[PDB]
Design a protein around this ligand. Structure first.
Ligand SMILES: *[C@@H]1O[C@H](CO)[C@@H](O)[C@H](O)[C@H]1NC(C)=O
Ligand SMILES: *[C@@H]1O[C@H](CO)[C@@H](O)[C@H](O)[C@H]1NC(C)=O
Lengths: 351, 41
């Protein structure tokens, strides 16, 4: 045998020892999953809700911009629908982590918007399109409106993008916790603590509380080190919540005022161009519920021992090898800590 | 569970992008995140 220390005879072979080891693995995984389930479901719920809510906000803002174009500038439709749809598509693509340039979104928006304004509103009556696109930026026809929108939307979209990435990475690490594979020595110690009493012919004897403590503090020496980074993660997320609905929803008013501004100088512009050519409540409740789990990694061995069958009195208990009257007395964790450090730096910088 | 007691109901299935979650500008998950089916109670 390689696990069950044979003091007398034994009622179990090597294959039964392997079966007990696999059942020990399954029991540890089930206990960790039961410890992590409440927090996992909380973060999954909130991640799903925030993702759907941001998509709803983007769709509604695109709808409102399209509706205000339909009502106030019918001469710019249906071209207006194309560039508005492209703009808000790129908005959503940026929110969901794709490589999109915010300044380029706004600049392509105004580049597409100016030629149809000139041809349908200012000078009524395809090849000259690029000359108009160049004149848009060369003559600064929209004034400071493009840079105003650029900063207004970049500031909110970056915090939203990093909020979603932080929620997803929290889900990732919490899913990793209950799937943390342990050392072989810990496998054998857990097998001894939970099952090796059956090999000695005992039916209902439980392991000592102190033996459970030494075993758990033995194989969770790495997992407990995650607690500092998890606390910093929680506090940095709290720093970040203290934004994007208001901006995307006022975009239509800002664009309308920019169109008025360009129409204001039409006299000189046409001649020159003719010559030349409940959310805040949700994030607050989320942070207040997330602060209740700041001790998650430090209380984990206590959970494993308090939810495993143990003799708390340390009397007539199993010490891993014999029935006593009184008890005598990294790689995946490294990846978790790496990702936590990364997301914590990213969080703190948006502050 | 089907939200409506009698007639056309709904059943949802979520699929998050967390195993692994994109980092340092990783490509996001490809395809749909939610699954919805009509149910008759
Ligand atoms: C926008 O809102 C109006 C409200 O009457 C609706 O009729 C229209 O279908 C909506 N358009 C989009 C694209 O959601
Ligand atoms: C963790 O992600 C894995 C991927 O297969 C999945 O199997 C598991 O159900 C997820 N975790 C939880 C605890 O629900």
């Amino acid at each position: 045998l390689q696990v069950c220390l044979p003091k007398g005879p034994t009622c179990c072979s090597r294959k039964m020892e392997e079966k007990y080891q696999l059942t020990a693995r399954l029991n540890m995984e089930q206990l960790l999953q039961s410890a992590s389930m409440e927090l996992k479901f909380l973060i999954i719920q909130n991640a799903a809700v925030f993702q759907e809510a941001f998509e709803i906000v983007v769709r509604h803002a695109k709808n409102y911009t399209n509706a205000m174009f339909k009502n106030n500038y019918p001469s710019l439709t249906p071209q207006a629908f194309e560039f508005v749809g492209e703009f808000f598509t790129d908005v959503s693509l940026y929110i969901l982590g794709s490589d999109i340039n915010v300044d380029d979104m706004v600049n392509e928006l105004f580049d597409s918007l100016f030629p149809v304004i000139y041809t349908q509103m200012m000078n009524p009556g395809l090849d000259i399109n690029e000359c108009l696109r160049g004149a848009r930026r060369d003559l600064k026809v929209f004034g400071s409106f493009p840079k105003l929108i650029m900063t207004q939307v970049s500031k909110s979209l970056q915090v939203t993008r990093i909020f979603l990435q932080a929620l997803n990475l929290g889900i990732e690490v919490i899913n990793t916790t209950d799937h943390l594979k342990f050392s072989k020595d810990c496998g054998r110690m857990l097998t001894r603590m939970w099952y090796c009493s059956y090999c000695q012919g005992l039916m209902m004897v439980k392991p000592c509380g102190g033996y459970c403590n030494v075993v758990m503090q033995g194989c969770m020496a790495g997992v407990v080190e995650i607690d500092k980074y998890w606390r910093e993660y929680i506090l940095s997320l709290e720093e970040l919540v203290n934004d994007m609905e208001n901006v995307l929803l006022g975009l239509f008013s800002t664009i309308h005022d920019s169109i008025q501004y360009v129409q204001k100088n039409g006299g000189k512009l046409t001649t020159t161009i003719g010559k030349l050519c409940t959310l805040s409540s949700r994030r607050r409740e989320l942070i207040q519920k997330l602060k209740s789990f700041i001790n998650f990694y430090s209380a984990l061995p206590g959970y494993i021992c308090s939810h495993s069958p143990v003799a708390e009195n340390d009397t007539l208990c199993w010490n891993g090898q014999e029935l006593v009257e009184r008890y005598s007395q990294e790689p995946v964790v490294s990846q978790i800590i790496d990702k936590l450090k990364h997301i914590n730096q990213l969080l703190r910088t948006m502050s | 569970a089907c939200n409506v007691r009698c007639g056309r109901g709904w059943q949802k299935r979520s699929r998050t992008c967390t195993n692994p979650a994109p980092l340092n500008g990783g490509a996001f998950c490809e395809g749909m995140s939610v699954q919805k089916i009509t149910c008759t109670a």
